[PDB]
């Protein structure tokens, strides 16, 4: 097995990456929740998806905090009581108010809780010794999440900003693969190029829906043939990435 | 003496009719909310629409208590926050849990409040001096509600039991027309025959969707031809019935 300290290079660089994304998450969530508290629906809607990109890019770490992640990011699908669940809070609760209902009424406390929760997450990440097995395992976890809910447009059922989250997951996974390139190369000379090709295929389909202002079209614009073309490469990436924990001597 | 055709007669009889329906509403609501608290989803679903018929038949009086009516019977449409509104309670809040979400989780307090609210309504109706203009105008008020939400199937957006509510509104309006028939036919017997024929047309179409028990098909079963055939009679009735207050000197 591989001693975690032998992976300090890529693990340290990943914590720097996660920390930078978390700093941006906090600053964007401050602005997003301030807009909600101020009743500025248009500004809140514009900030929603760009803010979430920073969370979706660091899911391998955020999901280590199971209850906090649920507070920040649970979907309607996660609640027996649906949209009416008292425990349905965070981004998707505000997504419903802003995009389906066009309101900020009584959303102030939900916005305040979301800001408090992301500031909590920032502190927990600062305190965290990053386990390389969770980092390395995180790329496969991200691609499994893409396969489960993002290809089908089931992450943002009211704003339909799923492509922002999709691209964030992919970017967060590619970052992990890139950082561990030397360690992968020591055991498997062909692996990085194999996954790079499938990442490039996914990135090219996603790029068909980027906008000049720096965003994405809504999910209803994604053609059925592009949706179908994503399934294969995403599944092959998930399978390939699922071998890395073992290959690198972490489990 | 009191004249034999004095309006104190039919208004008294309407309070009896409303009182009898509210007695049934309380007993059925007890059984409906008991099932919700028990977790018996199948029984609660079967009791939902027959319970509501008694409320829908007396809406001219129930809607005089604005906050109570909202607590018992508001729709998602009535809430800026939609399904997540804390003040979304009563029949349609439980309708969402039972029919959309297939759950009774945490619905106990909502069921307790619905039973308490209909018991409140029962006491308020007993204490109420019925305003004769609200009684006589109640037939038009009910037909306007049919035209606004029942004919288009927008009353029960999760259970789709709108035909029960449709028929209940129609029956409650026909009761008012029948009670004031002696006074109306003093003034305009041709007008009364015109109203009866449109009621008979509506009842004949609705009867096409009755089931073997005193039930109705769900709204999706209503053929588009039968929907368009309902539109004319309902709108003629809404206009004709809007003249009753003036015909009886209550404007």
Numbering used by the authors:
A (entry chain A), B (entry chain B): 35 to 285
Paper lines:
Herein, we report a structure solution of the apo form of EfeMPsy by molecular replacement. The refined structure of EfeMPsy consists of two identical EfeMPsy monomers (chain A, residues A35-A285, and chain B, residues B35-B285) in the asymmetric unit. Close examination of the overall structure shows that EfeMPsy is composed of two major α-helical bundles designated as ‘B1’ and ‘B2’. A flexible loop (residues 162–165, highlighted as ‘IDH’ in Fig. 1a) separates the B1 (residues 36–161) and B2 bundles (residues 166–285). Comparison of the folds (EfeMPsy vs pSBPs) suggests that some of the key structural characteristics of pSBPs are retained by EfeMPsy; the presence of two discrete domains linked by a hinge region, and the presence of an inter-domain ligand-binding cleft. In this work, a closer examination of the structure of EfeMPsy has revealed two potential metal binding sites. The metal binding cleft, Site III, is nestled in between the two alpha helix bundles B1 and B2.
EfeMPsy is an ‘M75-only’ EfeO-like protein with a C-terminal peptidase-M75 domain (EfeOII/EfeM family). Here we report the X-ray structure determination and bioanalytical characterisation of EfeMPsy from Pseudomonas syringae pv. syringae B728a; an EfeM family member that shares ~ 60% sequence identity with EfeO of E. coli K-12 in an effort to understand the role of this protein family member in the EfeUOB/M systems in bacteria.
